[PDB]
Write a protein that binds this ligand. Structure first.
Ligand SMILES: *C/C=C(C)/C=C/C=C(C)/C=C/C1=C(C)CCCC1(C)C
Ligand SMILES: *[C@@H]1O[C@H](CO)[C@@H](O)[C@H](O)[C@H]1NC(C)=O
Lengths: 181, 316
């Protein structure tokens, strides 16, 4: 079965993903059963579980696009997991949630508030791309693979995103085991 | 055309009285002694390439216990296979080609032909099994599988089963081991008739079970594997490692197929044209063309499937 770690923020939206039926969910698809673990990853709440997860297929990391306060918290939490000695090779599925709340947030709240160096015009297509770039900037791991997706707050169906990413991860690993690539 | 013998067949007419036994006279009337000088030296070359690579594979697995996984067993098998070809084949051939004629007697002829052929067949079916393993693992056809050490053992065992199904019958009366080509090296009699040992039925059995079936399986399995990787790459256009894997896997599959055609389509074509073109006659120079292509696989199947394999380049 597939082990999926589910990280992010209290107000990031993983609270809704986990409900599609260490807190374990047993959702399944395509004769493939997933074990989804909602855990924390802050720092203080990270030594409580990191030492007993091994053979984690992927790490689902959630980000509230409209939340500038937790943004750098999430950037550094991300960096410290993506570059973490236990998950240096565990591929990541990155949801940037509340896409539309961000589409309205950016109209009345410039992105410069939390990225002062941002020089682009505050439009959804550029600000969201800049945020995505900032998370992937911290990758620092040659062949890691970060599967990105921007989710329409609750108004979408993004379990398929997870499973396509997981299958891609799996085939890459099976080739690795055979000695091909 | 040739001098028919019981334990042997020398492709050279005795109407002149010149021909002798391949267990007897230096065969310098098949080819000038310079050719057998090169012959013996070439066997030492392949000893000093084959045993380095093939033993080191075994040694490395011992040294690094990270490599002891089920998927690599059949490559270890491959290494083992080619070491028969080094000792059963190349070493005992060395002590005969140095003379010009086969020294260790017809019992040494059976020993050489058997152990050489046993190694060659183990390698052949190791590659068939390797393709089957990769097919099941990556394409996930059964889709209710795990693949453990039990399955890897069955895969290795099956190569010994099939290898014996080819190498042992000439020891009991289905074809015969005789000096072929320049008569310093003994192998299967695929090129003469012999009703006492039923050569025709053995050659047809060989061509279908030990060539056509292995080739069909290898093409099919690697074809499905490439299709699967291509399909995955098609869906994840933005997944860099899958695009990389697509390209790399396809490079390797083409290499694999060409290696197997170079290795076996010589014997296949030679034996088939002997079979359908009975009005023909070949001498040592051409009867060692297929032996050439097959024997050198003791080096470059270990290269192609072990050295290039990405779990052993990291030990280098
Ligand atoms: C140095 C020589 C060795 C190990 C020679 C081995 C020869 C064979 C295993 C040949 C096998 C075949 C035939 C006799 C006829 C059809 C084609 C083959 C390769 C299956
Ligand atoms: C062929 O003739 C040579 C000439 O002496 C002889 O030594 C050899 O035994 C003969 N072999 C056969 C099969 O007639």
């Amino acid at each position: 079965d597939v082990k999926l770690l589910l990280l992010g923020a209290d107000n990031s939206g993983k609270s809704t993903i986990v409900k599609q039926m260490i807190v374990e969910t047993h959702f399944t698809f395509k004769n493939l059963h997933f074990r989804l673990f909602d855990v924390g990853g802050q720092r203080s709440e990270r030594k409580k579980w990191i030492h007993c997860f091994e053979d984690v297929t992927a790490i689902i990391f959630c980000v509230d696009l409209s939340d500038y306060n937790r943004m750098h918290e999430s950037l550094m939490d991300f960096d410290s997991i993506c570059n973490n000695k236990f998950f240096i090779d565990t591929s990541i599925i990155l949801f940037l949630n509340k896409k539309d709340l961000f589409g309205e947030k950016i109209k009345k709240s410039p992105l410069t508030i939390c990225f002062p160096e941002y020089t682009g015009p505050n439009t959804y297509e550029d600000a969201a791309a800049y945020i995505q770039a900032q998370f992937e900037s911290k990758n620092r791991s040659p062949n890691k693979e970060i599967y990105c997706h921007m989710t329409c707050a609750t108004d979408t169906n993004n379990a398929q995103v997870i499973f396509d990413a997981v299958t891609d991860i799996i085939i890459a690993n099976n080739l690795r085991g055979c000695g091909l690539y | 055309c040739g001098t028919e013998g019981p334990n042997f067949y020398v492709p050279f007419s005795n109407k002149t009285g010149v021909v002798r036994s391949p267990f007897e006279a230096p065969q310098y009337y098949l080819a000038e002694p310079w050719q057998f000088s090169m012959l013996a030296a070439y066997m030492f070359l392949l000893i000093m390439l084959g045993f380095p690579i093939n033993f080191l594979t075994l040694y490395v697995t011992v040294q690094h216990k990270k490599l002891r996984t089920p998927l690599n067993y059949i490559l270890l098998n491959l290494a083992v296979a080619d070491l028969f070809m080094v000792f059963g084949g190349f070493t005992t051939t060395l002590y005969t080609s140095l003379h010009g004629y086969f020294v260790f007697g017809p019992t040494g002829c059976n020993l050489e032909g058997f152990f050489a052929t046993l190694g060659g067949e183990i390698a052949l079916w190791s590659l068939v099994v390797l393709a089957i393993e990769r097919y099941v693992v990556v394409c996930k056809p059964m889709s209710n599988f795990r693949f453990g050490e039990n399955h890897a053992i069955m895969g290795v065992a099956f190569t010994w089963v099939m290898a014996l199904a080819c190498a042992a019958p000439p020891l009991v009366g289905w074809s015969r081991y005789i000096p072929e080509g320049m008569q310093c090296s003994c192998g299967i009699d695929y090129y003469t008739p012999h009703e006492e040992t039923n050569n025709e039925s053995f050659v047809i059995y060989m061509f279908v079970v030990h060539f056509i079936i292995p080739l069909i399986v290898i093409f099919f399995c690697y074809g499905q594997l490439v299709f699967t990787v291509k399909e995955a790459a098609a869906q994840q256009q933005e997944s860099a490692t899958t695009q990389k894997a697509e390209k790399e896997v396809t490079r390797m599959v083409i290499i694999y197929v060409i290696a197997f055609l170079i290795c076996w389509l010589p014997y296949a074509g030679v034996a088939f044209y002997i079979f359908t073109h009975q009005g023909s006659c070949f001498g040592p120079i051409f009867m060692t063309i297929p032996a050439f292509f097959a024997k050198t696989s003791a080096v470059y199947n270990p290269v192609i499937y072990i050295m290039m394999n990405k779990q052993f380049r990291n030990c280098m």
